[PDB]
Amino acid sequence: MLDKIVIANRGEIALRILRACKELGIKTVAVHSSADRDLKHVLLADETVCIGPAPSVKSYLNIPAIISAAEITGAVAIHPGYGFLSENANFAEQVERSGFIFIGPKAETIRLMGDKVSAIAAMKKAGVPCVPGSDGPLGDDMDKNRAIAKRIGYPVIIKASGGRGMRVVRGDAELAQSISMTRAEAKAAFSNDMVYMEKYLENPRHVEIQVLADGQGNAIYLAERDCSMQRRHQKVVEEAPAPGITPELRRYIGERCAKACVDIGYRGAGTFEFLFENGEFYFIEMNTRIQVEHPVTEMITGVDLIKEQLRIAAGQPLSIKQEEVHVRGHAVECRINAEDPNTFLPSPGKITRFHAPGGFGVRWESHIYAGYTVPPYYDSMIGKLICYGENRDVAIARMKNALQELIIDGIKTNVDLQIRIMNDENFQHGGTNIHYLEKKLGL
């Protein structure tokens, strides 16, 4: 057991971690900005420490302040949460070097997966499916280039090395000339006639795989999540499992992700985000941290990912074996944001009346309450509604009623938007792509 930890975060995730700590009997230290004195988790914590003024840069991104808090409270570990410093290799370094446990992966691992190039390298070497490409620029031999396009599978895309000069090709007959014309364009534009080729994923879905590794050779995968519904590349709705994914495909991608964890010597909780098209996965990134939408995975597997983070940080090996991990039911999550539901303009202010939805399969994750003011700093996400059901349709219906029950007055929220999305027939069908929400709201 960890004797005492600092929760290096705020809002809902801070409350989530705090709850985990209480259940495991871990003493909590809530570090907070001067504007977050009223945070629920702060009011519930065993010890509190103001670490700076409102702005994130002077508080939750203030490494010296957070570590200093850890020393004066005598904490043994620090939980970074998501965002802020969770994927800051330098932060993890100073934390361990100052004699505290970093509840997360090794700094070296964060750097590895924190860089696009080295991350891709590791995944391929480990057997994790990445985006197929020419693996280097192209030559003048059109037989070779066509062999590469054939292997990869059309459609493909040609991109320039300089830096434009980009072009999608959907058939063999038009590849050669497409390279020529793109090489000319690359030379007249980027002053360099060098090009390369990748697989072109036109309609992908954001499908990500949850994993846990104790950093002692053990690693398991906890099914997947579909987070395709997005605005400006920001997730709005997440669900688990992903519609259309058979248990055999889930086992396919999952086992590869687990072995990858073993290879890079991963530790803690992590996520492998992939683009998903025609039954194929293509690595995008690995979030070396807990994610916002982790709760939907908890609902269908019964695994408490936060408690597992804490157990692993304490040096304990995985108690759960892959065979014992079963997918049951379905879960959806709508992010509740303090913003205008039509213009997405932040909406800080005092919450004049609040009531949380309840009932079978309903899980409310939020720090907000009546009288609590949402400050004009930080991300606009103020809560998360997660509904579970024996199947996808039941989960969605639960979500409809629950959003209808949810009351948040005093500030604008995106609740109405979430209601629209639940009512969206294409979403009810399932399998909408990563462009659909914006494709729906009018480009």
């Binding site: 409102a54 994130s56 932040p346 800080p348 004009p376 700093y377 930080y378 991300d379």
Partner: protein, 80 residues
């Protein structure tokens, strides 16, 4: 409350994009900046305060137009 690294105003005054009425703006969206670089000016009581970047990266957005007043901690610029 907008995401991204936010350079906020450290004082009350009038925001300006340029050093002088006829001159070019210190920065533009898409431009690379270094720590210490002047992004704008906040004129307060004859003081021509140059607000500098506290983090290196690319300018994502410029949240205030010239001639407009700004308050303490008001978001001015977003970086990378």
């Amino acid at each position: 409350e907008i995401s991204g690294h936010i350079v906020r105003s450290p004082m009350v005054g009038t925001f300006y994009r340029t050093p002088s009425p006829d001159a070019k703006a210190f920065i533009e969206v898409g431009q690379k900046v270094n720590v210490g670089d002047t992004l704008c000016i906040v004129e307060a009581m004859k003081m021509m305060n140059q607000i500098e970047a506290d983090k290196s990266g690319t300018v994502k957005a410029i949240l205030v137009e010239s001639g407009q007043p700004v308050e303490f901690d008001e978001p001015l610029v977003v970086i990378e």
